[PDB]
């Protein structure tokens, strides 16, 4: 009579690694590194905007592309590669910092700054910002002299942020193709635009000169921005070449922004994103994208790390 103690085993053994062995077979193992990607932006439960052709910075200045998003609200903001912050050629100064701010803003609330002008044109428009006909940035005013080559009067406009949150303020400096064109618009003489706050001080001069044609135009409007503290004031002293703001921006709350090239899905629910889609996983690691954002498993170099979920597999003696 005999009794034997034993343990189970399989012919279906899977190899894992240990401190000592490499490729030791165990009965059962599971994967710890996620590679399974969902090629969509899972937006269920999250208020989502797909800016598309509207650049994120364009939501503040307001080219035609961003007219739908001038006061948008969101939990999840999606940037698209075709997006543009610009109609009339130019670029923001400190653009990326500003993007990072707007990505977690939860959207923007606009407020009129209440500037009034005299002895001056404000209907500055261009063929590049076509909205029905030739137009301009929706939140901005392109100031001219009055007739042509006429003198542009020195002005001083101020604005106080009477709210409890910081105010996003944006103005533009216009760079003409020539001093001839600059004179034709704002009159002769050197042009200066000074911007004063109570924790900010800067100065701006136009740089007229020939540049490659973008959208058929050689002129450039480069935007600048600051955050105005509550009860603090901004002052704009200028005499031409100035792109004045009409409204200020206020951040709504909290959000998250991503860059993607894949469609949206309001049925799938996710919390970790990358440009190629959404990562939904209980696994601690992933090998899809190092730049994934949101709440994500850690990125690793290895495509696979098997965790033994069973004992060492020792085949039966036949």
């Amino acid at each position: 009579d005999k009794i034997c103690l034993g343990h189970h085993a399989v012919s279906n053994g899977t190899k894992v690694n240990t401190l000592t062995e490499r490729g030791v077979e165990v009965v059962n193992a599971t994967e710890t590194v996620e590679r399974t990607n969902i090629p969509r932006i899972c937006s269920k439960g999250k208020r989502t905007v797909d800016l598309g052709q509207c650049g994120l910075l364009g939501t503040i200045t307001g080219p035609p592309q961003c007219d739908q998003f001038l006061e948008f609200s969101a939990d999840l903001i999606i940037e698209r590669r075709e997006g543009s912050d610009v109609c009339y050629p130019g670029k923001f100064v400190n653009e990326e910092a500003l993007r990072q701010i707007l990505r977690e803003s939860g959207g923007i609330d606009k407020e009129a700054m209440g500037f009034t002008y005299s002895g001056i044109r404000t209907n500055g428009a261009t063929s590049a910002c076509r909205r029905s006909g030739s137009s301009f940035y929706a939140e901005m005013k392109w100031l001219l002299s009055n007739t042509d080559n006429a003198a542009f009067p020195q002005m001083t406009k101020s604005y106080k942020n009477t709210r409890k949150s910081p105010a996003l303020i944006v103005w533009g400096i216009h760079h003409s193709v020539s001093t001839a064109e600059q004179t034709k618009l704002y009159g002769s003489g050197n042009k200066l635009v000074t911007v004063g706050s109570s924790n900010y001080q800067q100065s701006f001069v136009p740089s007229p000169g020939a540049r490659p044609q973008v959208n058929g135009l050689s002129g450039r409007i480069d935007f600048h921005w600051l955050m105005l503290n509550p009860n603090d004031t901004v002052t704009f002293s200028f005499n031409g070449a100035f792109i004045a703001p009409d409204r200020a921006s206020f951040l709504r709350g909290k959000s998250m922004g991503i860059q993607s090239g894949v469609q949206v899905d309001a049925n799938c629910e996710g919390d970790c994103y990358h440009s190629g889609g959404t990562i939904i996983s209980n696994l601690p690691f992933q090998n899809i994208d190092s730049r994934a954002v949101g709440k994500c498993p850690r990125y690793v170099k290895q495509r696979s790390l098997l965790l033994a979920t069973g004992m060492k597999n020792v085949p039966e003696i036949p």
């Binding site: 005999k2 343990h7 690691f285 690793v300 170099k301 039966e316």
Partner: protein, 169 residues
């Protein structure tokens, strides 16, 4: 037509548990699984599993841009930082899995030994080790007696005389 326990081989027929009993007597051969030892092992393994499922509440946001590349100097600092951190988590992941796997294997072998040592203590002086993980029982042990060992109801005092006689001569 002999049977063998652990020590050089497992049982591909044991399909209702991780650890088990295999006997042969006059009634024939039988194989049954032990619940307590199997469950102990499963609870420990899943205990590891839940530990690695604990998600992070740390949210990270974009620090650069893949449409409009940021400034070179700060961009290269960012890339160098990310790569440096990626090197760390890859190492950690490699080490964590390698370490856990070594422990999973060892605790499994441990449970085998505990079960073996338990049965050895049940049989007292009524059996001898054959060296293949089995016990040569020096008395008649029917299917009912075999079941008494599996559910820890075997009273060695009952068979002690019969066994020692056969053992000694």
């Amino acid at each position: 037509g002999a049977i063998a326990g652990f020590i050089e081989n497992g049982w591909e027929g044991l399909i209702d548990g991780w650890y088990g009993f295999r006997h042969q007597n006059a009634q024939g051969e039988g194989t049954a699984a032990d619940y307590k030892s199997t469950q102990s092992a499963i609870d420990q393994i899943t205990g590891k599993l839940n530990r690695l499922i604990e998600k992070t509440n740390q949210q990270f946001e974009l620090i650069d841009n893949e449409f409009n590349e940021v400034e070179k100097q700060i961009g290269n600092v960012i890339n160098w930082t990310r790569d440096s951190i990626t090197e760390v988590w890859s190492y950690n992941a490699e080490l964590l899995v390698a370490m856990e796997n070594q422990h999973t294997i060892d605790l499994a072998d441990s449970e085998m030994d505990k079960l073996y040592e338990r049965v050895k203590r049940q049989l007292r002086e009524n059996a001898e080790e054959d060296g293949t993980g089995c016990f040569e029982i020096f008395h008649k042990c029917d299917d009912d007696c075999m079941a008494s060992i599996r559910n820890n109801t075997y009273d060695h005092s009952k068979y002690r005389e019969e066994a020692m006689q056969n053992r000694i001569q």
